Amino acid sequence: MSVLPFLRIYAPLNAVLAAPGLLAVAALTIPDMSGRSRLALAALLAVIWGAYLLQLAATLLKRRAGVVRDRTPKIAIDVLAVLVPLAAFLLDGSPDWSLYCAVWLLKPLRDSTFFPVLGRVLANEARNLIGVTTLFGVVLFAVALAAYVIERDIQPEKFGSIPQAMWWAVVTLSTTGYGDTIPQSFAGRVLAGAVMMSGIGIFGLWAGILATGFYQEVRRGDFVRNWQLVAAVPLFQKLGPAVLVEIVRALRARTVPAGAVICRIGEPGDRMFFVVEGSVSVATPNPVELGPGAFFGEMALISGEPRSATVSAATTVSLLSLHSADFQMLCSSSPEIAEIFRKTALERRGAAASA
Amino acid sequence: MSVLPFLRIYAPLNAVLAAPGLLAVAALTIPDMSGRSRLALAALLAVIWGAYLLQLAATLLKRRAGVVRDRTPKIAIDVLAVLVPLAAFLLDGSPDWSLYCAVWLLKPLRDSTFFPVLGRVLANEARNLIGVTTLFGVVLFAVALAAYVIERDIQPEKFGSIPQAMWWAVVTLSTTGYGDTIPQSFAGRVLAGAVMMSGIGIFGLWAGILATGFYQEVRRGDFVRNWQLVAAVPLFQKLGPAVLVEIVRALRARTVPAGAVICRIGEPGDRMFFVVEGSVSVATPNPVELGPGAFFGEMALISGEPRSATVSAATTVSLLSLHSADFQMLCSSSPEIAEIFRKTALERRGAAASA
Amino acid sequence: MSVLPFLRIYAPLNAVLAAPGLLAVAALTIPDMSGRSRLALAALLAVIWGAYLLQLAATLLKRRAGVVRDRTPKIAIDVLAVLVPLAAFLLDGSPDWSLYCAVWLLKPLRDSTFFPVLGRVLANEARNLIGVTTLFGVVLFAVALAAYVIERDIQPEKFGSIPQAMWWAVVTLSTTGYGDTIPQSFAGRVLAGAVMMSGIGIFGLWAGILATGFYQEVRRGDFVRNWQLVAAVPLFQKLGPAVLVEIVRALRARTVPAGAVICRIGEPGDRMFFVVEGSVSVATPNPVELGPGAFFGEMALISGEPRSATVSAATTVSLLSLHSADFQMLCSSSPEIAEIFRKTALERRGAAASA
Amino acid sequence: MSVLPFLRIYAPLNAVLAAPGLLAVAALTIPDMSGRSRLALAALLAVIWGAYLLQLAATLLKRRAGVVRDRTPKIAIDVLAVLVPLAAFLLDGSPDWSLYCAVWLLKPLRDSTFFPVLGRVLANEARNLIGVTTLFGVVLFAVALAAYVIERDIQPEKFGSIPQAMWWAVVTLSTTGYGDTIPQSFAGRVLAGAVMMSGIGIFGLWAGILATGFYQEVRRGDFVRNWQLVAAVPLFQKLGPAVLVEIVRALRARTVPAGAVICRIGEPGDRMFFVVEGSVSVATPNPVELGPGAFFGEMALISGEPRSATVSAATTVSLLSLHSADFQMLCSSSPEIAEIFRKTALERRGAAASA
Ligand SMILES: [K+]
Ligand SMILES: [K+]
Structure with a gap:
């Protein structure tokens, strides 16, 4: 409810082509089928075979980022990704070789983050x-x-x-x-x-x-x-020790890509963000483009009002995010900090229109 | 367990008439049916059609509250609410046109608050x-x-x-x-x-x-x-900063309509309320009608006793509510405040009977 | 895991006889049945009818505890508990009258505490x-x-x-x-x-x-x-304000009947209790019978050892109970109190054997 | 996610042989079966019978650890573990005697810790x-x-x-x-x-x-x-009273056996451990073998880096474990303690290579 996830979380086409590759299977599994489309998708196996096989050797060039790595998992399939159909192609001379489409099913699991997250906890519980x-x-x-x-x-x-x-x-x-x-x-x-x-x-x-x-x-x-x-x-040298543990449970970080929108003007102001890397488009007469290490929304949250500026994703920004209560928590947690966010709620009024 | 929800939460008749309108469908779906009631409810489509269509143009007068609004959702159906049956009425000359009763099903979802609450969180998780x-x-x-x-x-x-x-x-x-x-x-x-x-x-x-x-x-x-x-x-200028976050998690606000009951006398005293807008009927010899910005129950909760007055909903009151523990929390949280709630637990003893 | 519930929580025989009364039904529901046992249990309806009917008039004497009460629920069935079979006995001259054994099913729900607990929350959520x-x-x-x-x-x-x-x-x-x-x-x-x-x-x-x-x-x-x-x-005048809210979430109170056991000697010491009403049997050479307003287990918990005395339920004691951590919490929460529980962990060593 | 459980948690062969013993049953349950393997596994009953019966008398020697014990459960089956088949062997002269393989099913439950954990809570709730x-x-x-x-x-x-x-x-x-x-x-x-x-x-x-x-x-x-x-x-004389309750909820203790690995060098540093009993293999030029009452990982966690040493389980170590946040909690909770863990994060830099 408090985060803006964008930029193709389901990005890698290696993750993508497992799906169409296996839907290629079933037409071979069916009697009374004309041979036209029967082999037409057999090519598409040779495509995805050839496709990962094209990707493959580029991966076998593991001289990229070669300082300290643990790529026993990410290689584990790519080897058998192509060998198993290949030996299957010959010895299983009958069409049953395609029953070694039980192989690509790890390729989604290859670059499946959140699967190591799965197996992490089982070995405690x-x-x-x-x-x-x-x-x-x-x-x-x-x-x-x-x-x-x-x-x-x-x-x-x-x-x-x-x-x-x-x-x-x-x-x-x-x-x-x-x-x-x-x-x-x-x-x-x-x-x-x-x-x-x-x-x-x-x-x-x-x-x-x-x-x-x-x-x-x-x-x-x-x-x-x-x-x-x-x-x-740059402001968090003064935060109390136990202050952060109270906060970061709700703070999630996600990234926005360039060109996207972050918060549109006039919508009901419900949250504020912390910028730490990237840049934005603060839609004002003089755009106050705040780069790495900034924030916005106190203009909307102290007053509890709609938005003051159509902030849009100018570049790819590693974003944070924060709803009110936990900022009201922060405002409540420290009068030293609302002092500056009082000033910010006045500076950014005139500084939004001025340079 | 701690709240008094009243005043027709399922209020709008636009939300209501989706249900009877679709139960009008099934009789057309059945063979061996006499034509009498067959078309009798076809009218009721023309009713609900005509009914929302009557409501419709009043909504197309969107010069009401026209300052800043986001009514792309609430209009999105009302347009097709009437057009889709209409074009369906002609081109689908056979009775199948009523299979475009797949249309009103958003009308409940039109003014379905708690559905935007649904979609809010999915885009984080x-x-x-x-x-x-x-x-x-x-x-x-x-x-x-x-x-x-x-x-x-x-x-x-x-x-x-x-x-x-x-x-x-x-x-x-x-x-x-x-x-x-x-x-x-x-x-x-x-x-x-x-x-x-x-x-x-x-x-x-x-x-x-x-x-x-x-x-x-x-x-x-x-x-x-x-x-x-x-x-x-008027009393909450002195509350500590972190005090509120501890409290408001349990505080729910709901409204009571006029004439209803709030708490009856002699029932076991289990909770206290904060009035902030409206008025009540403090059933006493001299009714102590407390208006916007008041409370009651400390007379019952400090002593842990039945109720001292049949408080009834005189007007439509935007109510709060609170069980003991979280007021015992407050009494525990601040001796400065129990000072006045000690006085209140004495003032409202004599002030309940007197003016 | 931390409580000793005893003394017939499923006590009232009014709650009991709903079960056998309805199992009396089914034999009437079956063809090819000899008439011997057919009517033999029809009596048992007249028993339970007569039984609650015997209980009934004693309840209609509601001059017991007649100061302020809400017995609209507890009477609501007892009326129809006997009238509905009775009118059913005559007008439904055929055996179908026993299909008004849909009546006793509230009698469990009559004195079903935890059912008002159910309906309490639904009207908030x-x-x-x-x-x-x-x-x-x-x-x-x-x-x-x-x-x-x-x-x-x-x-x-x-x-x-x-x-x-x-x-x-x-x-x-x-x-x-x-x-x-x-x-x-x-x-x-x-x-x-x-x-x-x-x-x-x-x-x-x-x-x-x-x-x-x-x-x-x-x-x-x-x-x-x-x-x-x-x-x-008598000791809890000095407890801090917020101290109690931290504690009572885990504290459950239940009652033990007379004669039962509370904690046996030599079992691994895992918890301590607070007595507030009743008496015990501290099995020692000189029994230290602690009555209303006492406790025991610090002898076992500070040292983390087996039990020092076969404490047994001498009388019907309204008991509390407490595992270590939340007493370690208390010991951690206050050095003023461990001072006396240090003394208690020394007094009750010699005072257990002496008078 | 934060613990290293090893050393045969599913250790006792008494727990093991319940499984194969009951899979011995089914072949007797089947018609058209040749008698060869029919009785071949009947021996295996006599094995497991004889096996526990061999274990049995060693258990009936309950002069081991005979100071204060509660072995009514652990004996309760071992008696009937052998008697019930035996009397079943004779009186049930037909093969149905093996239907008294309903007996070993408690033998898993014999040394099933986590089953007393089950029944503990039911008698409160x-x-x-x-x-x-x-x-x-x-x-x-x-x-x-x-x-x-x-x-x-x-x-x-x-x-x-x-x-x-x-x-x-x-x-x-x-x-x-x-x-x-x-x-x-x-x-x-x-x-x-x-x-x-x-x-x-x-x-x-x-x-x-x-x-x-x-x-x-x-x-x-x-x-x-x-x-x-x-x-x-030896360091925890200075920890605050309420400090521990905050911590130990996440602290789990498990044991590693000798020879195993604890944390490998160069993997991403994600956690730190407390040793309290046993010894390790701090893989360094001069191995800093820290025995009972030690810790490691602050070298990796303050900096947020990979591992500094292939710590491996030299002996059977009663281990604790701890992820960062709760150590960041501790670092946040006390500047007095980060003082020494600052020194430790400098001592163990030179002291890792030196003796
Ligand atoms: K099912
Ligand atoms: K089925």
């Missing part, structure tokens, strides 16, 4: 998951057995064995309800009463384990990435 | 959703493929292709369990063990992404809307 | 639910329509109309998957991809709305019920 | 669960009845009675959707609209009850287990 995972296996067979107790007599064909019910156990426990084979007696139907009661309570925790400290990491992601852009601000 | 959305697509086809590996032999008619399983993938992953086509072998049935394990863990996060900072915005909604009604209170 | 409820209805028919677009041709018998799909809409949206009527084409099967994506995201919020501030109320329930038992402690 | 559990039973039969109202006429075979719908009630309420018997009329199909609305809102709370304070206990688990390793640090 999966301690829980295991004991739950065991406990899941406990309750699975602890409960799955109770059905073999009963309908083995008149449902041999369905419940004549154990795993046939362990099947129906999880399908019954895992919120699903397929509906191929269901009991007929009373007491067997009694038993389900605690099952959905369980599996929703079980995963009531177990799935909850995930968002539990995942949120902490992501709530932490906006600090670890943003204890940067702190000393850059 | 959907960064996550995409990488999850990709990751969802990863795990979809990463897993959907594994079924074509197997039952292509003896289930051509069901699993003779890829998307036939991608269907069964999400139906299996998305907690659903339709139950038309299910495997027969062992190992294919092994594979589901991690699927519900996944999709509940996947959406264990992904849905959790939504309420995550949505709650922040709504927890923020009760500050941004309520840093107003702060300086209105 | 259902503002959200409505706009979501509308939005649910938006997405329902917004999406339900798209199926009538398609399979009306070759599924008249199933999708020959609108509500036949609105049925399949919610069954598809609401996580369920019945599996009677499912599409056959491609594009109609494409559409489900956003549905489970939606309904899990929709109720990802909407159900989340419930626990959102419900937890606040229940987290508040342990303060509003426990700003009592505060001044009772 | 299940107060809620009951009133919800009742309320679940309310809404069950309150709603289950409404179907018998209707389709008794034309669905006797399916809805000719009450419990046949109570079945369909929970299957309809519990998110499941089996799909054997579904209504046909309009109004009966109307009724489901509030059901999924309910059960997802019901378990929207009820499952939420579990993670609610479970998280508190687990968030508490990392303090109660870690108010230890506090005074061990």
Whole structure:
């Protein structure tokens, strides 16, 4: 609610072409298909093959930025990105070779930031998951057995064995309800009463384990990435020690590209930003182009009014952002700082029109 | 638990008539129907058409409050609210024109506040959703493929292709369990063990992404809307800077209409209110009608007793509200203020009966 | 994890007999049943009828505690508890009268505390639910329509109309998957991809709305019920103002009955309690029976050791309870208080064995 | 995200052999099976029987650590671990005796820590669960009845009675959707609209009850287990009282085994650790082997740089761990302590290469 993300977060075309490449697959999977388009997209494999293969050697030139790097992941696929279809092309002489389109599926995961963010937390908290995972296996067979107790007599064909019910156990426990084979007696139907009661309570925790400290990491992601852009601000030598921890939880940094808009004039003033790198277009008679290490919105927030200037993204700006309350927090947190933001709320009135 | 919402939050009849208008549809959708009521409700389309169309031109008079406004949304439907049925009435000479009752469905969304509140946060946090959305697509086809590996032999008619399983993938992953086509072998049935394990863990996060900072915005909604009604209170020049941030998170403001009740006498005293605009009916021998900028309940909360007066909504009051603890917080937070609320807890004892 | 709830929280037999009374129903609902037990439990209706009816008149004596009360709820059922079967007994001369066993179902809800706790919060927050409820209805028919677009041709018998799909809409949206009527084409099967994506995201919020501030109320329930038992402690004149708000969130009060155990000796010392009303059995050579307004566990917690005495519930004690950290918080929060709890950790060493 | 768990958390082979022992079962459950492998795994029961039975008597030697213990749980299964198959072996002369493989299922739960952690909290909070559990039973039969109202006429075979719908009630309420018997009329199909609305809102709370304070206990688990390793640090005589409560919530302690790696050089410096027991391999020209009561990472965190030394687990170290922010918190929290960590950030520069 407080951030302006722009400039192609879904940028790399390597990330893009995994999708069309795999939709090329299915037409080969279908009988009664004319051969025209059958091979027409087989080329497109050779394209994306050739395309990453074109990208590939440029990556194998890893003399770029070669000081200290960890590119075992980013290379791990690019090797097999082209070799696996190639050997598949020959030995699997039949068309089944294209079933080695199970290969590009990591290419999205290649430059998938937020996936290392995933695996980071599991190696602290999966301690829980295991004991739950065991406990899941406990309750699975602890409960799955109770059905073999009963309908083995008149449902041999369905419940004549154990795993046939362990099947129906999880399908019954895992919120699903397929509906191929269901009991007929009373007491067997009694038993389900605690099952959905369980599996929703079980995963009531177990799935909850995930968002539990995942949120902490992501709530932490906006600090670890943003204890940067702190000393850059020339004013923040005087901020109190514990002041920052109170603030940066809500501060997110994102980038805007050149030419875009940042805040339009006359819209209801709801937030203020800190510039730390780049430049803007403060739409005024004399444009007050504030570059790295600036801010704006106190003109709108102290008074609680619409906007005073159509600030637009003149260049690619590494932006911060901030809603009122946490600036009201700052105004509340320090009379020393509102002194200057009082002056700023007067300087930028005349200084907006003047040079 | 701490607020008195009244005065027709579901007020505008424009919001109302979307519902009956669309229930007018279905009778046309049914064979063996006599023509009597068939067209009888076709009028009601012409009513609601005519009704909004009556409202319409009054809205096209946008010389009301015409200083600075953003009514591109509120007009966006009202135009097509009437044009689309109209052109549909002629060119679709057959009765199918009423299938352009897909049009009014934004009219609830027209004056749906809390929908802009929805879209506000997605443009900060959907960064996550995409990488999850990709990751969802990863795990979809990463897993959907594994079924074509197997039952292509003896289930051509069901699993003779890829998307036939991608269907069964999400139906299996998305907690659903339709139950038309299910495997027969062992190992294919092994594979589901991690699927519900996944999709509940996947959406264990992904849905959790939504309420995550949505709650922040709504927890923020009760500050941004309520840093107003702060300086209105004549007593709040002395409140400490950080004092307010501690408080306003729980303070919600709502309005009561005239004539209603606010707190009845003798009920267990559980909360106190701040009046800032309007008037009340302090049911006492001499009614102490406190107008804009007042409060009541300290008579009930310091002692922890039932109510001292049947305060009733005499006029339409922009109300605040407050349970004890956060007033005990305030009483704890400041001895300077309990001094006057000690006096108030004595003045309003004699001043309740006297003038 | 920090509380000892005992003394029959599920106490009143009025709450109990709703359950057996309704299990009396089903035997009448079944053909090929001999008449012996058919009427045998019809008596048990006359019992529970007669039983509450016996309780009833004692309740109609509402001259007990008749000073100020709100018993419109608790009477509301007791009236119809007996009248509705009675008039049902005659006019419904056929056995169907017992279908007015839809009546006792409020009797659990009669003395169901925690149900007023439920309805308390909805009248602050259902503002959200409505706009979501509308939005649910938006997405329902917004999406339900798209199926009538398609399979009306070759599924008249199933999708020959609108509500036949609105049925399949919610069954598809609401996580369920019945599996009677499912599409056959491609594009109609494409559409489900956003549905489970939606309904899990929709109720990802909407159900989340419930626990959102419900937890606040229940987290508040342990303060509003426990700003009592505060001044009772003779030591708490010196506690700081903001000190209590930090503490009482974790403090829960419950009662133990006489004769029970409170903490057994030699078990790992993990918590300490505050007595405020009742008496105990401090199992020592000279039993140090501490009555209203006492505590114990600092002997175990400062040292971090097993228990020093088999404290057992001698009488019915209105107990508090407290784990270490929040007492370490208190020890950390105040050196003035650890002074006496240092003395207490020495006095109760010799005073435990001596008188 | 901040911890290094190693050394076989899933250690005891008693915990291990429950799994293979029960997979031994199913082959006996299957007709048309040759007798070769039929009995081959019957031995493996005699193995695991004999195996725990071998472990058993060593456990019955409970003269180990026999000072004060509570081993009623850990013995509770080991007794029946061997007796129940044994008596089952004879009296159940038919092969059904192996259906007493319902016995080992507690053996995982025998040494399942985190299961006592489960049951700890339920006896504080299940107060809620009951009133919800009742309320679940309310809404069950309150709603289950409404179907018998209707389709008794034309669905006797399916809805000719009450419990046949109570079945369909929970299957309809519990998110499941089996799909054997579904209504046909309009109004009966109307009724489901509030059901999924309910059960997802019901378990929207009820499952939420579990993670609610479970998280508190687990968030508490990392303090109660870690108010230890506090005074061990020779530097923590000067820490402020409330300082620790702020910190230890994030501090988790885990152990590394000998030989493992702790932090590798050149990786991006993201965290620092506190050693309190054990020794390390500070990979430098003169290895600065810091033993019990040490730390490292300030060299990497004040500057925000990669690692300065391949610290590796020389011995089995009871480790702590800490990301930056909470050390930046500490650096912010105390200028007295950054004084020494300024010196440490200079001493360990020259002291890393020197002795
Ligand atoms: K189904
Ligand atoms: K389902």
